[model samples]
Each structure stands twice: as C-alpha cells, then as structure tokens.
Target: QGTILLDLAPEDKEYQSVEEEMQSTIREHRDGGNAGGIFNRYNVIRIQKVVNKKLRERFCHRQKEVSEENHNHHNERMLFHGSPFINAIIHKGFDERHAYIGGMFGAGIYFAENSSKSNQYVYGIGGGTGCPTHKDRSCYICHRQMLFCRVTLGKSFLQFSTIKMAHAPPGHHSVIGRPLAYAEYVIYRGEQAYPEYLITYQIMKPE
Candidate 1:
C-alpha cells in the first residue's frame, strides 16, 4: 500500500525514451488543432517513476482480467493527469472521493491523451510539494508538474456529454467523454490507474 519515487537521470535511456514520447505527444497536440494551448512549443523535463509493489500487483490483476475478457486486448494506455497534488497521487494512487467535482465528466479520476489538456491543471507555480517552492503559494515561477499514468480501460463506454455518476456505467469498467478535439477518460476504481511518471517542466514564453 506504499509508493516510492525512483528518479531517472538525464543519462538514463529510459528517461530519454519517456522524454521522446512526451515531446511527440505534444507535437501531435500542437499540430492537431491545439497550437494555441499552453503546450505550444514549451521546454520540457521529465522525471519518471517505477510505482509501488502492491499497486502494481493490483493494476496487473485488473489488466489481466481486461485482457482475458477482451481477447487479449487489455486496452492499457499511458495517459496524462495534471494535478497540484502530485505528491499525494504518487504516494497513495488515485482516489475518486478527493477528485474535483466540477469535472466535465463524473466523479472519477480523469485522464487525457493530449498533454495540453493535462497542462491546464498544472499552471500554478508553487502549488504542490513537488514544486521548488517550500510553500503552496503562487509566484512568478513557470515550472509545473503533471503525472503520466498507466490506465486500464476495460470495456469503456463512450458518451457524447457529461453525466453525474459515482462509478462507471453498468457493464462497463470506465467512461470516455469525447468532446471533439480532445477526449477525457474516467475510471471509477482507484486500482485501475497507476502513476508511472512525474513530469516537471517550464513553459517558455512564445517568441
């Protein structure tokens, strides 16, 4: 039930790989109609994590069930979840009860494929303990932190609009709300998501 953070240095190949993937995702967002967002041409830095043992086992079991039920397609996705409480999310996994109620979707942990969408939540400079500021107060800093999570989407039900619910729809393990250019996915169970990385970067001023 405990989690640890294994920081990846710049020389690490795994770190480079993660950075490359994130840059590519950002490129896709910028080129695919998100050019005006905060993620447009920003300097990047990535800090990756290995995750907790018990949480990994739980996620693995859920993944197995989804794979076995859906002809070996587990539908596991690496998605972004930007939050000011990066420390809490990494140490104890995602809890829907503490989730923001004003979410476009329902009462569940939300994830996005677009990095820009995740960036929207991490704009505060000294928001979390993950920040350089010892206190949780906003300042002139442009640095921010976001979580790159591994989400298992088992029998996701697609919805065109928002609906209030504490859990996934009947017969489905998660919900996908597609609001055109960007899509948000929600999973009711905390065990279905694991924080795989902690990305901290500075958004440079557009030249």
Candidate 2:
C-alpha cells in the first residue's frame, strides 16, 4: 500500500503476508541493483501498445485524428481512461500478475466490491513514483519474471500471498498452491476484509 495503506493488526495474518510481498516488490522496485533499484512488474509492450491506443481512442479529447502520442511511444506508467488500471493475466505461471485495468474499451467493469478503493491506484499511484533514478541497473524485470513477483507500476496495493510455486505445472512459473493464499485485508477502503479465491480468471496448463 501507500501512505494511506491498510494497517495489519497484531492478530492479522493475511495482511501480514501482503505486507511482506509489498515490502519485497518495493525493495526490488526501489533499490535492486544495476538500475540501483528494482522496478516494473514487466515490460508489457504488447499490453502497453494495445492499452495506449485504446486509452486515448476512447477518452482523451482529441480530433478525428489520433491523440497527442503515438502507439510507438507506449509507456505502462501512462494514465488511461479517466483513471483505470490493468491487473490481469492471460496465461499460466502468470497467476500473480494480470492487467489491473480501470474500464474497458467499451464499458466500465467493476473489479472489486470496493470500487472507491481504486482511489489508491490513481496516476502517480506508485510505490516509487518520486524515488531517485540511476543507470546500469539489472533491477528491471521481464514479463515472465513478473509471475514470481508482486509489482507496482505506481503507488499501488492489492497484496497477495504465495502458496506453492513448486512443480506439478504451476503455469509458466509452475505455481503457488494458493491453498493457503488470499487472506483478510486490514485496510482497503470498504467496510471489512475477508479471505477470497483470488487467482487467474481461467484455468491454465503448463508445457
């Protein structure tokens, strides 16, 4: 979470798990190595380009022509559709990662029961939005690696816990059991938090 993050009570467990994951993502996203700080969930050039074209095509007030930017200059950090995000996955081992988008090209899809909580994912909604930058960094990760990690394109929060991450085909990453993941959140934006089955929308198979 951010400065307005949820607090984990002494008796909390899931919140504790999310906290650890968040800490790891932030650490990697902030102070990894080559880059002198870890960053990015993945370089979703595919999604970015797609999302890029869509963001402005639907929202940005423009002429009959395209918007100010071109698809060639796609950046995941850019804002989209009034303030939406993408957190979804399209394959296996890609469980923990997804395109947490705001609204779609056509309609406004309500992701969580607490839509207001989206306030936390606003533009500049990042874990290291204002952090210093460096060079020669190996901190940057790939799309596949985004599978084993929790990430933050901005000051984002929606922590999850790992369960398996072992064999028996866990998607591209050979996954987590998730049998023990997903617990009650301490401070989101709604009334209360509870354990939920949080995973890929469709079942996946390993190669």
Candidate 3:
C-alpha cells in the first residue's frame, strides 16, 4: 500500500476528509490480505483561447462563404485549387526529402527548381520575440506559437561503422545518418557540457 498526500483548499475540508477516509479504507484492504485493487488520481489544468470577437465574427462569415463554395468538392481538390504558392510551400516542405529531413520535421519548407530533381527542402531557423524586463522568454513552438525544432540523431563513429549499408540508395544522394555524429565529434568530444533540449516558439507575420 502506498501513502497518499492530499493538497486542497482550506475551505474544502469535507472533501479532504472524504479522500482521507478512502485512503484509510484502501490501507485496511491491503492489510487484510486482499491485493486485487488499484488506485490512480490526477489533476486538471484549464486553458483558454482569447481573441477579438469582431475578428472572429468576420472570420466565421468568410468561412461560411468558402464552405458553401466547396461543399461538393473534396478537401484535397479544394486545397489544390486554392493557391499555387501555398501548394508549392506544402509540397516543398512535406513532399520532398532533403527539405523534410533538414527542416527539423517541417519547420521551414523550401524548393530548388533548377536542381536535378527539383528538390524540396525543409529546415528550422531559430527566431523569437524579445522578452520584456519582467517577463520570461519562451520558444516560439512551445510558448507563443507552436513551431518545429531541428532533429539531430546522435551516434558515435564506431557505432556507425558496424551497421550494414543498404543495397539501393534513396533521395538526391546516398543518405547517411551521420550528420549529428560528425557534429558531436567536432563539438562535444570529451566535454562536460552536452547538448540539451531547449524549447522556444517563434511568430512570423503574414506576407
């Protein structure tokens, strides 16, 4: 049996007392040689999204007009018909490999039209809002707005050499999973200070 610690408002003494009695019952059950029960608990945190009412009303109106126009069409068709620039952005970011791998899971998408295969590339760039004197700064993705982070798969050179190479290569060139490995050898070799997860959010203005 596990001991329970209760934290609640002083005014909720009755509720606290009820919970304490429940814990005591569980303890009694355990002591009585009945070990066929399970206990679990959790706390809830509330989130609110606040925006301008007038802006919301206008947005709803536009949404209704768009919905009516696209009622009989498929979502993919609608997406394709919307804008070429947006389509290019999506294709470059999501449809291509070099951009997808580089972008840190679709942070920033770009395309190279003149390349051998018209390669689409994705990469992450770190930029964020300035923090005021009294406020704490947060990453663009986790704080103000959700943005993607760069992915770095870490491995050592000895470990890399042991793996069997694939027969057929994919993408623009022979894809090797050693970018982070090379980076580690160059920067983090025998250092007490190692890489750490840092969460930050970035906001971009519409063009």
Candidate 4:
C-alpha cells in the first residue's frame, strides 16, 4: 500500500522549517547560471508523505546494506527533487521509468543538494502557471512543487563528466555527480530514497 499526501498548514512547524531550509539551500548553491538567478519568491506549502510499510522497510533495508558495505553509518542525505508529474510520485513513489532520459549519469532518479538545481525542473503549473496541482485555490502568487527526499548515499562513486550509467558503478552504491560546485546524487533503486516532504513555492523576481 502507498501513503496519502498530508498537506501541512501554513502555521505548521514543519512547514515553516522546510520553507526556511529550502531557501537556505537555494542561497548556498546560487550561481550566475541559476534557472532565474535567484531564490523562490512566493509562499511555500510543506507536504508530508506517510509512506506505507513495504516502501519504508525497503528504504530502511537499503540503508542498512549501504551502511554495511561502507562499514559506517548510513551515508544518508537530504536532497531536493522536482517534477511536473508530482502527483504520480506521491501515488506510486520514485520510479526509474519516470526519470528523464539523457542525464549526465544516464537514466536514473536525479537529486540535488542545491534547490536551484532542482528548481529548474519545478515547472509551476505546466511550466506555464505557478500552481499546477492546486487549481481550486486562487492566489496572486503562482506555485511550484518539489520533493525533499532522504537518500542513502552509502559508498558513492564520484563522477566529474557526463557518462551513461543505468545504475551505480559496480563497486559503488550511488553516484555523486560533480561533487564540488554543483553536487547531484543518483540512485538506480527507488527504495534507496524516500520522499520525505513536498515543498510548494511561488517564483519571485530575481533580486
């Protein structure tokens, strides 16, 4: 069984914290080549996913396996993922089939330590409107959605250039793309990552 999406109220503690945290990540990774050269401008909504037992256990087991191979604690990280078909993710969880082709690391689920990197994919309302999922609600500000996922890096292999890889290299549990300036994590298995929170925000004018 899958989990339902729990939309956090504007006043909820997690909602507030995630909004602030996302902003920080965006700022920390800001560069001249950003999607719009700035941070998100509108308000944000934090959605929590209560994943079911099967998926949760799978993620946990993968984490343990990664820890064992690395002989250390779970090399877990909180990363951001953006997609136009967000509802599908909430309903079916992360799937490689949904991954966009032609990644530097090939066809795998892509995640980024930088919000802006992920923001490029967060097309608000069909990449045409700010609010794609929430059409009933009307506001002056448009909205876009992203997923904040907990990923187990385990023993990650470093990659500096574009390459085609269906999965992590033979000896690695994951791939770290360009770890220096812009770091992106890629995992072949869907269970290695858990969609922890959904952040919805409106775009703002570049400052």
TM-score of each predicted structure versus truth = 0.76, 0.18, 0.20, 0.77
Q: Which candidate is the best by lDDT?
A: 4
Per-prediction tally of clashes: 0, 42, 11, 3
Give stretches of model 4 more than 4 Å off.
9-13, 27-42, 103-105, 124-141, 179-181
Q: Compared with the true structure, what per-residue lDDT tens digits does model 3 show for residues 67-99?
A: 455453211100000011222322122222223
Q: Per-residue CA lDDT of candidate 4, range 52-153, in tens?
A: 666678888888888888887678988998767667776676777665644455578778887767776665312324344554222335666788889988
Q: Could you tell me which 10 consecutive residues in candidate 4 have the lowest summed lDDT?
A: 124-133
lDDT of 2 by residue, 93-194 (tens): 112122233112211111221111221232223322322242212223211111112211211223346321111221121111121211211111111111
Instruction: Evaluate residue 188 in candidate 1 and report its C-alpha lDDT on the 0 to 100 scale.
Output: 82
Worst 10 residues of 2 by lDDT: 188-197
Q: What TM-score does structure 4 among the candidates reach?
A: 0.77
lDDT of 3: 0.21
Clashing pairs in 1: none
After TM-score superposition, the amount by which residue 89's alpha carbon in candidate 4 deviates from its true location, in angstroms, is: 1.6
Ten-residue stretch with the least lDDT total in model 3: 74-83
Superposition error at 193 for model 3 (Å): 42
Query: Candidate 4: what lDDT?
Result: 0.70
